[PDB]
Design a binder for this molecule. Structure first.
Ligand SMILES: CCCc1cc(-c2nc(-c3ccc(C(=O)NCCC(F)(F)F)cc3)cs2)ccn1
Ligand SMILES: CCCc1cc(-c2nc(-c3ccc(C(=O)NCCC(F)(F)F)cc3)cs2)ccn1
Lengths: 191, 191
């Protein structure tokens, strides 16, 4: 409530400047509370970013779980596109949290562990689907599925986030989903 | 000379701890010089890391130029393996400089611009070879070559460096070259 106001203030300010340049007083002020009232809800501004990242990561995770439970009736290319799109739309809808959360992996063990935990879960699910595709005779047994999954997930992390940040170099945001789908489909189904 | 001693000291200390935990006095002490003598050679410890990274990046760049000028007599898979191997061996021989240099992209515009400049050069060369392969009828015209090149180069940056750092998740270092070659060959030659 005042908690949701603090989180919304932080996400808004992170569009303008880095967490380094945002004070607890900036977050309190934005949320219409005092500094000590802020400390009732969060121990630090770093905790606010951790909560924002945790919400975005869990949103992507629950969207991927929804696909898993409600698979689309489409070809393998459109299937992998639907999965990559969960990450494109979820993180691409929260670019300031994505940028700040990735930067915080350097300084926060809690942010690093959160990111690590979910990447392990997403890679494990990727590998499980590749193994299912191999089991049904649709994909060839080339690389170990978990190693292939790891590299494809790490490609998407770096490529999606470079695109969102407009880094030089980056794939244009309007081309990045097609670019990643090509590489996933050719590497998963290619001999 | 005393310059090479400062650089060798810094590369040695970076194996033990982050640049944050290395003082100018630590570098002077290691190089057998005083603090003011250090400032005769480098303006800051940040400049020392920039020079170390610049040397490693130029080593990889000159190795790739050597391949370009002395192409191996081998199949397309072993050809791309030779190119990725330049980065695997060069950066993998300097893991502390690689780790510290990547971390410094966050805080140093000079490190960020150096990294950006060379990634643009490597992606441009990748695209040029893919276009040559398309021109000779060996590769199909699928994605725009520069967009495919960008994503493959960014995959290698994230995947090689996660492997060297032993991040969770990462591909084991002994498996990462085969993993990347698979994805490059299938995505460049795959319909
Ligand atoms: C089988 C029927 C249900 C189903 C499953 C999928 C799957 N997609 C993925 C996946 C995982 C991670 C990514 C991914 O982008 N990681 C990187 C995450 C980031 F945060 F770093 F970007 C993409 C797809 C894994 S299974 C797609 C469609 N339908
Ligand atoms: C045509 C005959 C000469 C030739 C050329 C190649 C080429 N290889 C690459 C390349 C570029 C970047 C990478 C790469 O790993 N980037 C990422 C760099 C990093 F620093 F981030 F890791 C790999 C291969 C580009 S052309 C290979 C063999 N023989």
């Amino acid at each position: 409530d005042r908690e949701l106001a603090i989180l919304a203030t932080a996400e808004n300010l992170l569009e303008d400047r880095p967490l380094a340049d945002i004070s607890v007083d900036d977050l309190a002020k934005g949320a219409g509370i005092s500094r000590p009232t802020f400390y009732f809800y969060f121990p630090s501004k770093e905790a606010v970013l951790l909560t924002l990242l945790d919400r975005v990561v869990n949103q992507a995770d629950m969207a991927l779980q929804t696909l898993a439970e409600n698979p689309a009736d489409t070809d393998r290319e459109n299937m992998w596109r639907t999965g990559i799109n969960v990450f494109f739309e979820t993180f691409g809808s929260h670019k300031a949290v994505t940028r700040a959360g990735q930067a915080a992996r350097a300084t926060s063990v809690e942010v690093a562990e959160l990111w690590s935990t979910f990447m392990q879960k997403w890679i494990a699910y990727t590998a499980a689907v590749i193994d299912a595709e191999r089991d049904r005779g649709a994909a060839p047994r080339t690389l170990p599925a978990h190693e292939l999954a790891t590299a494809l997930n790490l490609m998407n992390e770096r490529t999606l986030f470079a695109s969102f940040a407009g880094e030089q170099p980056s794939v244009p945001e309007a081309r990045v989903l097609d670019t990643l789908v090509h590489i996933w489909v050719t590497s998963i189904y290619g001999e």
